[PDB]
Design a binder for this molecule. Structure first.
Ligand SMILES: NC(=O)c1ccc[n+]([C@@H]2O[C@H](COP(=O)([O-])OP(=O)(O)OC[C@H]3O[C@@H](n4cnc5c(N)ncnc54)[C@H](OP(=O)(O)O)[C@@H]3O)[C@@H](O)[C@H]2O)c1
Ligand SMILES: O=C(O)Cc1nn(Cc2nc3cc(C(F)(F)F)ccc3s2)c(=O)c2ccccc12
Length: 315
């Protein structure tokens, strides 16, 4: 089954295309090839600095009538420097204009931490600590709710929120809309069993990012563990006559997660989609879960003293 029901009553494709690090001169073609071979969900963000080029591809496939807008599920995220009440609508509208959309299907608070507003995405003090904004998760959440009530977004959600931060929103005085999704890092080295059961128990769908362990992350070190080169995972792939990436994509699908592998390589974009025709066993699933080592692609050092940094807390 290709889609999962959200608590806003809409259906979300469980496979989407990631766009973080997709070069602006390549992502248009990447998104066009992806829609041609079946993707109907694209994961975007203003901080990725490529939403205009993503939008060009979306607009072209709509114009070509390859797909209808109702058949696409387009996600974007509010960056940290825009948590302030007065900046949220403009931020969303800039994303909308760049993506050539009149609404988003899902708009996420990208990280629970607000940063000082301005031109800089990572405003720093002279010792390299991020400069916080005094804004809190709950006021930001009300501003997201306003977007729903203005018709600019169909669903709102969060990303990189821990257990206690999710609970903070679920317990918000006057909460009007629950988060639909919590998009978090998740792969066999960061299996997230506690956070996932909590969110799922509450009707919040979980999206897994960096499902392949983000081999193109700009801060990679050779001594880091490598999912795609892990012989243990490679063995499971071989047994199923699939590639290691295919196994790494099907794994979160079977945990009732949405997953958003990034590629700009047309052959891989198609390979990554061919994951609805094979099943990992229970034993495979528990074996992959056993590889957890709480290793994170995404946890910027410059942010670890922010009041709302999410990853001190166990989950
Ligand atoms: N919410 C957030 O904070 C957050 C954080 C991180 C990521 N995300 C989202 O999650 C998406 C996916 O995460 P990610 O970009 O970090 O990494 P990823 O999807 O885990 O890995 C992307 C890397 O894998 C390569 N790759 C793709 N398919 C492959 C295949 N079949 N075989 C071998 N290599 C393959 C890509 O190469 P090519 O592109 O050269 O093919 C690229 O180097 C992002 O792009 C973004 O949309 C969200
Ligand atoms: O953001 C993505 O989508 C990918 C992403 N991840 N990271 C690692 C990060 N670690 C963080 C930690 C916090 C924190 F909440 F923990 F304070 C807040 C914000 C971040 S960004 C980056 O540094 C980054 C830089 C440019 C574009 C995308 C990203």
């Amino acid at each position: 089954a290709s889609r999962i029901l959200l608590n806003n009553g809409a259906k979300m494709p469980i496979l989407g295309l990631g766009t973080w690090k997709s070069p602006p001169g390549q992502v248009t073609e990447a998104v066009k090839v992806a829609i041609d071979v079946g993707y109907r969900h694209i994961d975007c963000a203003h901080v990725y600095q490529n939403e205009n080029e993503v939008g060009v591809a979306i607009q072209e496939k709509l114009r070509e009538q390859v797909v209808k807008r109702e058949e696409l599920f387009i996600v974007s995220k509010l960056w940290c420097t825009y948590h302030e009440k007065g900046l949220v609508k403009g931020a969303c509208q800039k994303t909308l204009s760049d993506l050539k959309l009149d609404y988003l299907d899902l708009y996420l608070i990208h990280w629970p931490t607000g940063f000082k507003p301005g031109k800089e995405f990572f405003p720093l003090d002279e010792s390299g600590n991020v400069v916080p904004s005094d804004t809190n998760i709950l006021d930001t959440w009300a501003a997201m709710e306003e977007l729903v009530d203005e018709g600019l977004v169909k669903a709102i959600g969060i990303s990189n929120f821990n257990h206690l931060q999710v609970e903070m929103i679920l317990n918000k005085p006057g909460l009007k809309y629950k988060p639909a999704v919590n998009q978090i890092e998740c792969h066999p080295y960061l299996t997230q069993e506690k956070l996932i059961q909590y969110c799922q128990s509450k009707g919040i769908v979980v999206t897994a990012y960096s499902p392949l362990g983000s081999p193109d992350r700009p801060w990679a070190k050779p001594e880091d563990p490598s999912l795609l080169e892990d012989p243990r995972i490679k063995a499971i792939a071989a047994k199923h006559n699939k590639t290691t990436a295919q196994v790494l994509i099907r794994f979160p699908m079977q945990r009732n997660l949405v997953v958003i592998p990034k590629s700009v390589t047309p052959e891989r974009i198609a390979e990554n989609f061919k994951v609805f025709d094979f099943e990992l066993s229970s034993q495979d699933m528990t074996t992959l879960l056993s590889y957890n080592r709480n290793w994170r692609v995404c946890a910027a050092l410059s942010c670890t003293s922010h009041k709302d940094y999410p990853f001190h807390e166990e989950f």
